[PDB]
Amino acid sequence: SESETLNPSARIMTFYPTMEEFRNFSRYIAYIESQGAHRAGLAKVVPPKEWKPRASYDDIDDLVIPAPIQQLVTGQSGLFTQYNIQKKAMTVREFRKIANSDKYCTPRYSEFEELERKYWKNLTFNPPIYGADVNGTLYEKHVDEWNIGRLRTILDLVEKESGITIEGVNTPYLYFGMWKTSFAWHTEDMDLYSINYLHFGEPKSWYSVPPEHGKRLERLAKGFFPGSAQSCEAFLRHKMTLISPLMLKKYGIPFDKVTQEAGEFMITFPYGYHAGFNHGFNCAESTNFATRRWIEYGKQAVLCSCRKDMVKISMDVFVRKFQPERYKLWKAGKDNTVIDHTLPTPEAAEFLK
Ligand SMILES: O=C(O)CNC(=O)C(=O)O
Ligand SMILES: [Cl-]
Ligand code: NI
Ligand SMILES: [Zn+2]
């Protein structure tokens, strides 16, 4: 089909919008999907150079980080499990000082491949500290383009209808990273989209697996961590599992890599597995969002069954509003719709024309 013909390689795509294109978020997501970006599970958007979401970042040093986490990694042979050790609350100037410490600072290198090799070589040593999951935003209250605090997608239906707020999902998170800080392989909660903006600092590097191959990754993971898989159907949602690209290559898992610079956006797509690490001191802001296309993913997302605090969104409202003709069938457990990961979201239809 025409969707199979676009981005047939499922490679990560980079987009350079004009300020006019950049204005409407959902519309531009539908555009990049109409170009097949979603097939990679991950895409980069460089905003127009004339766009800035904050005046200056010089006031941050006093901002608080309630629960920094020390990332202890255990494993070998490209397979690792990451345990978080919550450290005491600390300011940003403290975190920055510790991050630029001779102990934790970035190593010297030339090509990115050298720093990547060093990452996968020393990942288990000198556990760094990640200032992750900090409630807040660095956007100025007047920025209307791609504002992570108010993107105005249909995910807003969760709060609007129920008042439920889910920190980091329909609210923004800040991530203060230092060298060697990692995010494990995962798809977003409820297999939503995510948006990640790198405010400032050293780059953040990403690996992505096309959604149409996600299941393969899962199978591989189950073979490597059979205990975890036995305990929980979706153990990858614990966000503790690190797998090196050489392991993926070795077992035929298709993936792609991209490096994220300050001032750039990354979009992750439904059921797009991703992982990565930070090069040094930096600050990112992210949240989740949805499109009509996500609804089916939401209905079929395989959720963690071993933790009672995992994120779970009621899909009822979305099915009633956008899939009325199926609601009954779905409530009776008979909606056997099959997801085609290559299709773009219906909102993109006008771009397809
Ligand atoms: O910033 C991080 O450490 C991890 N970010 C994501 O997984 C994301 O934006 O989808
Ligand atoms: Cl195991
Ligand atoms: Ni993510
Ligand atoms: Zn679980």
Residue numbers in the entry: 3 to 355
Q: What text comes from the article?
A:
Two families of histone Nɛ-methyllysine demethylases (KDMs) have been identified; the flavin-dependent KDM1s (lysine-specific demethylase) and the Fe(II)- and 2-oxoglutarate (2OG)-dependent JmjC-domain-containing enzymes. Here we report systematic studies on the potential of the catalytic domains of representative human JmjC enzymes to catalyse Nω-methylarginine demethylation. The results clearly demonstrate that some, but not all, purified JmjC KDMs can act as RDMs.
In the initial electron density maps, other than for the methylated arginine itself, only weak difference in electron densities were observed for residues in the substrate peptide, suggesting that the mode of methylated arginine peptide binding could be flexible. OMIT map (where different densities were calculated omitting H4R3me2s) as a guide to locate any unmodelled difference peak around the KDM4A (A/B) active sites. This unweighted omit map revealed more than one likely conformation of the methylated arginine side chains and traces of H4R3me2s peptide backbones; only major conformations were modelled and refined in the final structure. Although care should be taken in over-interpreting ‘static' crystal structures of substrate fragments, it is of interest that the arginine side chain was observed to adopt two different extended conformations after refinement. One orientation positions one of the methyl groups of the symmetrically dimethylated arginine residue sufficiently close to the metal centre to enable catalysis (within 4.5 Å). As with the catalytic domain constructs, arginine demethylation was also observed with all four of the full-length proteins (KDM3A, KDM4A, KDM5C and KDM6B; note KDM4A was used in place of KDM4E as KDM4E is a pseudogene) tested on both ‘unnatural' and ‘natural' peptide substrates.
